[PDB]
């Protein structure tokens, strides 16, 4: 029984989360710091799984194991509210998201059926330095918590969470950041997804979007039409020579927000250097040869379930967008043009950072999904979406 709204959450018992070092939903936080001290001895044994299931760390450099994980998520990972769409993270995207600098094999935590070896559960941690108000902490980012549909409501997700917690504790890390579509104890920030149609005909045909209150299809196509080429002078894809300045621009830009990553130059290379069908980054190189702005978005398609003709939606997700000379509105306008050029059906963006300054103007429509942001074992006051400066995959 997961809770999507805060109303349905207030009427919920959290048997598992009540046992965890996170604030309760009711309380308001007036302080900053760990919920509980660091542990100086850690459980050495993996947590017990139900009979017939076993832990297995997944070597994602093995193409067959990576494909098993692709399939687990492709068939059992997050769906929309109406069970019409499901994320379809590609194998090569999963490698990008799960092997950033400092990744550890034991943090790719799989569950298998003992007899068949079928992969039926997964959770992941990756290291990340996180800036939270006035504190910088080494943390992990938790992602890809997935339980096979046939294994659900058997309390496997709490075991996955305790096991990854244990394995992260063994490396001396006691805080984590993560997001969820559901409300849990206790969001540090609530962000709302917005959507910018790029191929409205397809979106309406697959019932991803619907025709607005008093609008025809022909009108909808004209409303969402875009230029063929971006307009910003000197926009071009990011190259290796840009890694330092992109790191510099990002670091300085993120200082205005209250929850942000702190990336090394190697992490900037990993997260932004373009990879086709995974991550796109375009820089603005001005008339003096200086990079002054950049935009980026990652590729995350979805499966269209039970549909005879259209099988997939290609979605771009706004990543980090840094402006110092080009107006953010123009940057995001060129982002839409580039996504359209690259075959995307929709461009998604959260209402975090300064995104509210362009969402409505660029004809984004509000979504039905909130993205809650959470910290494990860290108390701090909650913040508005515009102070959240962290984007995950």
């Amino acid at each position: 029984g997961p809770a999507k709204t805060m109303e349905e959450a207030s009427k919920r018992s959290y048997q598992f989360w009540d046992t965890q070092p996170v604030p309760k939903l009711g309380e308001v936080v007036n302080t900053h710091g760990p919920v509980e001290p660091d542990k100086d001895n850690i459980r050495q044994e993996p947590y017990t799984l139900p009979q017939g299931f076993t832990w297995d760390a997944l070597d994602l450099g093995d193409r067959g194991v990576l494909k098993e994980l692709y399939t687990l998520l492709n068939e059992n990972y997050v769906e929309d509210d109406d069970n019409m769409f499901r994320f379809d993270y590609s194998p090569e995207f999963l490698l990008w998201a799960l092997r950033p600098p400092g990744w550890l094999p034991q943090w790719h935590c799989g569950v298998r059926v003992v007899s068949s070896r079928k992969l039926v559960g997964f959770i992941s941690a990756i290291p990340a330095n996180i800036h939270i108000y006035d504190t910088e902490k080494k943390m992990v980012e938790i992602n890809f918590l997935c339980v096979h549909k046939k294994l659900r409501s058997k309390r496997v997700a709490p075991v996955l969470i305790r096991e990854i917690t244990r394995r992260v504790h063994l490396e001396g890390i006691f805080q984590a950041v993560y997001t969820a579509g559901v409300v849990l104890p206790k969001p540090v920030g609530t962000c709302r997804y917005w959507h910018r149609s790029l191929n409205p005909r397809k979106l309406i045909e697959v019932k991803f979007s619907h025709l607005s209150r008093n609008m025809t299809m022909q009108r909808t196509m004209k409303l969402y039409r875009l230029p063929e080429t971006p307009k910003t002078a000197g926009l071009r894809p990011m190259e290796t020579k840009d890694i330092p300045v992109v790191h510099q621009l990002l670091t300085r830009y993120l200082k205005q927000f209250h929850l942000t990553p702190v990336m090394s130059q190697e992490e900037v290379e990993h997260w932004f250097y373009p990879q086709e069908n995974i991550i796109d980054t375009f820089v603005v190189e001005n008339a003096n040869g200086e990079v002054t702005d950049f935009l980026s978005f990652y590729t995350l398609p979805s499966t269209i379930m039970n549909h005879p003709t259209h099988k997939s939606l290609k979605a771009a997700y706004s990543f980090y967008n840094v402006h110092t000379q080009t107006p953010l509105l123009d940057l995001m306008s060129d982002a839409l043009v580039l996504a359209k050029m690259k075959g995307f059906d929709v461009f998604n963006a959260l209402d975090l950072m300064e995104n509210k300054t362009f969402l409505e103007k660029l004809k984004f429509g509000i979504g039905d999904g909130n993205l809650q942001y959470y910290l494990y074992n860290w108390k701090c006051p909650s913040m508005g979406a515009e102070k959240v400066g962290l984007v995950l995959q």
Binding site: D80, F87, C146, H195, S197, G369
Partner: peptide, 8 residues
């Protein structure tokens, strides 16, 4: 995990 949203 991420959240799958669609236009309200």
């Amino acid at each position: 995990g991420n959240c799958f949203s669609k236009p309200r």
